[PDB]
Amino acid sequence: GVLKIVKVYLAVKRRIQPGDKMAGRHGNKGVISKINPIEDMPYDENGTPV
Amino acid sequence: GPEEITADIPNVGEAALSKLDESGIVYIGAEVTGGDILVGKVTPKGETQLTPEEKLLRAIFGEKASDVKDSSLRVPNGVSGTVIDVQVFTRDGVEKDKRA
Amino acid sequence: SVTEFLKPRLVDIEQVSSTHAKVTLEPLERGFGHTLGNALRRILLSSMPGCAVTEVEIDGVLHEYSTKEGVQEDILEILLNLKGLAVRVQGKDEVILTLNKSGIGPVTAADITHDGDVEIVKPQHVICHLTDENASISMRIKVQRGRGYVPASTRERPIGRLLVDACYSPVERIAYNVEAARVEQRTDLDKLVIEMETNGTIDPEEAIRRAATILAEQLEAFVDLRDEFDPILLRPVDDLELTVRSANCLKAEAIHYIGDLVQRTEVELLKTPNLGKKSLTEIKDVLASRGLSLGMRLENWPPAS
């Protein structure tokens, strides 16, 4: 009873945002709480932020 | 009667059919959001009795409108993306369209 | 004197490289070096203007999740490469560049068609690679000026136009140091050295001056410290084609607008003299002809006029 089938594929890109879950390899997991502007971050003697 | 996959839907505007090709299937690379039409399809609803009002409707707005109804595939609400691939499967013995 | 501060001046600029510079400010009073340095660093990292690629059109491609025959890279990788193209525009806030290439080899920024008001500061920037002799690429690239970071999702288009996230800031990093200044006859003055790393599209001195101008404009506020209804409701009652007696009854009640009429209930109209059920039915009919009804509630009427 089936004449035809049409399949459509949609692609999207997801960026990182507060509420996403991150982890290391040692069981240290967490959730992102805030995206901080570049000049608010701690930096070293050469001006390189983390 | 069989359902037809077509680009000619009587109850939708010209703008809503702009992203469909001649076969009633969306183009590759189109940006779509919730509510947009991907595949246009109609379902038969014809009857063998024609009332005077039905005759007036057919005379003024055409016979295609009075025979079929919209059953198209639409993007679910809250979904967006880009069309990157389309596949068509046709039963053996049925004629193939341009896209296939 | 006590109320006499020494004003810093720009002493020297050391152009270590095309993208690395040092700027010296001297002399500075006790404590002003850090006060100026931190504010200047924040402004320089935050608010400098620049140009960036925002749109790309390639002849044979429809979207970015695809490939081109004879090209080593995906379309996404080409867009990422174009996101790091440093361009200086001399006379306008928008420009379109053209790239045409063919043959085996790398396609770099030196292959972009020359423009009078467009300068390429890194001609060796690689864009893609062509791996076939009978292969060619042609594209149009849109560049415009701005500041900050504007992702393409926040900001119809024909199929084939590819959006690129815009990073307008030309400054890569800022560092600063405060040292002792060997002034003629004092030993309590400082010197501020600012190390600047950019992409080569902005002059250090004009960056410093622009940051100082922004800071002064923001300061000038502290320097002087001190302390819709729907249109149909606004139409007059006589716009309704009411009968003579209905119009007289409504005028006797001092109703001059539709907003006044729709707020009145059926009971109040019925209790009014000289208004029967027929005229109230006619009023309801003419209101229903425009999709209105009696018994609506409104806040802040009359509409301040």
UniProtKB/Swiss-Prot annotation, chain B:
Description of how the protein assembles with itself and partners: The RNAP catalytic core consists of 2 alpha, 1 beta, 1 beta' and 1 omega subunit. When a sigma factor is associated with the core the holoenzyme is formed, which can initiate transcription. The rRNA transcription and antitermination complex (rrnTAC) consists of RNAP, NusA, NusB, NusE (rpsJ), NusG, SubB, ribosomal protein S4, DNA and precursor rRNA; S4 is more flexible than other subunits. In pull-down experiments interacts with CedA. (Microbial infection) Interacts (via flap domain) with Escherichia phage lambda antitermination protein Q; this interaction renders bacterial RNAP resistant to transcription pausing and allows it to read through termination signals.
Practical applications according to UniProt: Co-administration of salinamide and rifampicin or salinamide and myxopyronin suppresses the emergence of resistance to both antibiotics.
Task of the protein: DNA-dependent RNA polymerase (RNAP) catalyzes the transcription of DNA into RNA using the four ribonucleoside triphosphates as substrates. Resistance to the antibiotics salinamide A, salinamide B, rifampicin, streptolydigin, CBR703, myxopyronin, and lipiarmycin can result from mutations in this protein.
Post-translational modification: Acetylated on several lysine residues in the presence of glucose.
Taxonomic lineage from the root: Bacteria, Pseudomonadati, Pseudomonadota, Gammaproteobacteria, Enterobacterales
Name listed for the protein in its UniProt record: DNA-directed RNA polymerase subunit beta
Coiled-coil blocks: none
Protein family (similarity comment): Belongs to the RNA polymerase beta chain family.
UniProtKB/Swiss-Prot annotation, chain C:
Descriptive protein name: DNA-directed RNA polymerase subunit alpha
Effect seen on changing residue 42 to C: In rpoA112; temperature-sensitive, blocks RNA polymerase assembly
Residue numbers bearing the N6-acetyllysine modification: 277-278
Described purpose of this protein according to its UniProt entry: DNA-dependent RNA polymerase (RNAP) catalyzes the transcription of DNA into RNA using the four ribonucleoside triphosphates as substrates. This subunit plays an important role in subunit assembly since its dimerization is the first step in the sequential assembly of subunits to form the holoenzyme.
Enzyme class, spelled out: transferase
Disulfide bridge positions per record: none
Post-translational modification: Acetylated on Lys-277 and Lys-278 in the presence of glucose. PatZ controls acetylation of Lys-278 but not of Lys-277.
Reaction equation(s) it catalyzes: RNA(n) + a ribonucleoside 5'-triphosphate = RNA(n+1) + diphosphate
GO molecular function: DNA binding; DNA-directed RNA polymerase activity; protein dimerization activity
Domain notes: The N-terminal domain is essential for RNAP assembly and basal transcription, whereas the C-terminal domain is involved in interaction with transcriptional regulators (such as CRP) and with upstream promoter elements.
Organism in which the protein naturally occurs: Escherichia coli (strain K12)
InterPro entries found in the cross-reference section: DNA-dir_RNA_pol_insert, DNA-dir_RNA_pol_RpoA/D/Rpb3, DNA-dir_RpoA, RBP11-like, RNAP_asu_C, RNApol_insert_sf
Gene that this sequence comes from: rpoA
Signal peptide residue numbers: none
The keyword Ligase appears for this protein: no
